[PDB]
Amino acid sequence: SCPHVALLLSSGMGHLTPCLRFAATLVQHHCRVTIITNYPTVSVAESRAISLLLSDFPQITEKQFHLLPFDPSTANTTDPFFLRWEAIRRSAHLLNPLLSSISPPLSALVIDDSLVSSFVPVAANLDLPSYVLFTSSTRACSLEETFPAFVASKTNFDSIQLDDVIEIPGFSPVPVSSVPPTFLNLNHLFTTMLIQNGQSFRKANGILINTFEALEGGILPGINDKRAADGLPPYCSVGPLLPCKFEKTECSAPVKWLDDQPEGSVVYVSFGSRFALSSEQIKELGDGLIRSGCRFLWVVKCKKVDQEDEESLDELLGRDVLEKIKKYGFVIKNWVNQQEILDHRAVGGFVTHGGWNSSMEAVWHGVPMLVWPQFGDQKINAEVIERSGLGMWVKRWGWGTQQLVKGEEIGERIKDLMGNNPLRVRAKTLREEARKAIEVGGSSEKTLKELIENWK
Amino acid sequence: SCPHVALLLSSGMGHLTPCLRFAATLVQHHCRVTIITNYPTVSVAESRAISLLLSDFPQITEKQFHLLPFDPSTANTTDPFFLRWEAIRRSAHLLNPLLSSISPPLSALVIDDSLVSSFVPVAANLDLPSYVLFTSSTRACSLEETFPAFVASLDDVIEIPGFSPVPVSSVPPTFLNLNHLFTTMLIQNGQSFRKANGILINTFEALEGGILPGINDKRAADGLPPYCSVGPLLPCKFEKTECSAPVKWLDDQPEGSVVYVSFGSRFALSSEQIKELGDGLIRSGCRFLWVVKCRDVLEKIKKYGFVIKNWVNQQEILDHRAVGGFVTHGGWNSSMEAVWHGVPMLVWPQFGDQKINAEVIERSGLGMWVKRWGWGTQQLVKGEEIGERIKDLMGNNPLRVRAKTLREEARKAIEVGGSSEKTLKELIENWK
């Protein structure tokens, strides 16, 4: 028997990557997978990732979701990805006929965590087990559930101090300074979407998280015991979700550069796939990389959408400054195979924004991290990484999007990262604890095993 | 629902490759697959292949076949690959306990054509549909089925149902040798094909003309198993590397201006022919990629050509736009690889069924094959004669156009509503 599972995709490599990786896992665990795509993807990368998955996995059916015509002026925000989310959510009543067509009949529908509010009702109509695929950390998933209860308690949500805390069941309380800055702005489309999603998690049959038990410090089994005792869906840890084989082009220019570098001497720098630093911050970060006295691999973005980042790096910095930096380190404004770079033995550290997928890839390859939160769940994530002993988080730098960090300071913190032996040691340990979880008898592999057996 | 299919592997790199590719094809068509391996493999090429297959398809389970101790003294040959077959065949009854323990329940067993007679009774024991994965062409396949009837009865000719009759000159050289352990198998196997539920051939309808439906009509009347066309068998994802030492050389060459010369893993050219073949390439005045299997001009030969003496990725070299022609021994695996990539080929049959396949290639219009050269193992070809024929291959435009035509017919056969996919769907649907 092969349980037919449907994956409902949203938008962004942050969400798309763990969805595709999970699709590949399901397929390799004797399930039938059908992914529900929507075009045109905001970013070119999304399009390529899907074409590469379908090419490698012909046994994966693709049904295209056709959204309703959308007027972006009806939405609060100018963010392309958020806008796309809203388009898909507004087309929710159209998913019902589409699912009925699919044969053989489904056994479970795995929804992206940004669409839960709108599509959990749909799945209920067809008596379909629905599972939330949470793309971030467990502590982040727990704040999302609690945040509706929080704002309801406040008469005036404007006169709220940064010092105030939001208590999370089973986790260390979260300071409002760590809460996504946009949350303080209720009525923003992002906030309204996450308030409604967090209220609907309880309607799902389970919550899938890209994590493993050892990472969380063993607080998870207790939490699930309390959650079950209150009629709440269980936290299902199936991570680390293994990077697919189509993510390893062994002849990349940056990969070839790395082969000519000493072991553990290269600092890899990336701030994700949907965010770009300001002009001033980009200039300062360039300065700080030279000051670090470290070999570095730097992935620059000047705009959120890769499709629109047409300007050359010469324009922002100047050929003078740019040519100078290319002497001390490798700089590239393109899409790089991040997981392929992280596994390379030349890479000794990672300067990241705290995006969960990145952090989990660094856990998987055992690379120390310097987390520099820019927005969203990255501060909550920063703390989780720090408590795992894998990364360091400079709290003095605040949010990246609202505070400028000058070059001199960046250089000194990167030096500390390249010589932080407790981080290196913990990495090796946490890495081996990661492999064990996906091996047979592993904690993660075990949970996925009971999932499929209930499908079935 | 997922049909559980078991693949029975034998030794030989020529038989292994289509076996491993068909295994992947089944997985990609929603089947659970289990392969039966025997170790130690005769070559590292087999071990490497199976390991890379199990590496890229974790869902494919491997249950090893342990065999009875074999006395190589009772052999009628000294070939390592054929010897392994006899070693496997004599321990055939050892497969019933292994096959019954497999979970979930099997719904079909696929056997290599070298093990058909010994292992098709095993299937009957277990109420399992057995299928024969034939590793050569349809024409060669029909010869094997009717050859036992023929010997129960040179310029002579053998009657083949469905095809043009085959001259005995095209029949494998060791078929005329009944003492040989090889011939004894082929005699025993051919008579046993009738017991199997179907014969899987790496081919598509358009390549053989519309004859397969017509043949299967007659085959159904006699109660004979149907000819299942499922080809071409595409190379797996482990059979492609972004860069190779040859490929890097190919990216500096003009389009279609390079001759690829390969004679397979098993066979090796004579020392005498290598010098002759070497001089013919230089005489051809064409850029060439030469594979040598087992020296003052050795450096001067690299002037307009590239030489490598190791395992190469043909499917990579053949897709490449710099390659315009193929000098092949005529193996059906390499031939389909050239069909799929639409590369014109010059067939130079060395042994086995390569003369038979050569007639299949010529009839299709994809290649030319020099009758005057005969068998490669038997007959030597001088340098001046080789170089001349290569130029004919590199200057033949009807060939290049036929290649383009066949390539689309081949590609259309895999896609939905295609020839080969239709038979495959109906096959799996029967299992169900």
Ligand SMILES: O=c1ccn([C@@H]2O[C@H](COP(=O)(O)OP(=O)(O)O)[C@@H](O)[C@H]2O)c(=O)[nH]1
């Ligand atoms: O240049 C890049 C940028 C992104 N990524 C991949 O894109 C994902 C981004 O996920 P993340 O957790 O950082 O969330 P984001 O903030 O980017 O949406 C990661 O898995 C990276 O491997 C990549 O491979 N190369």
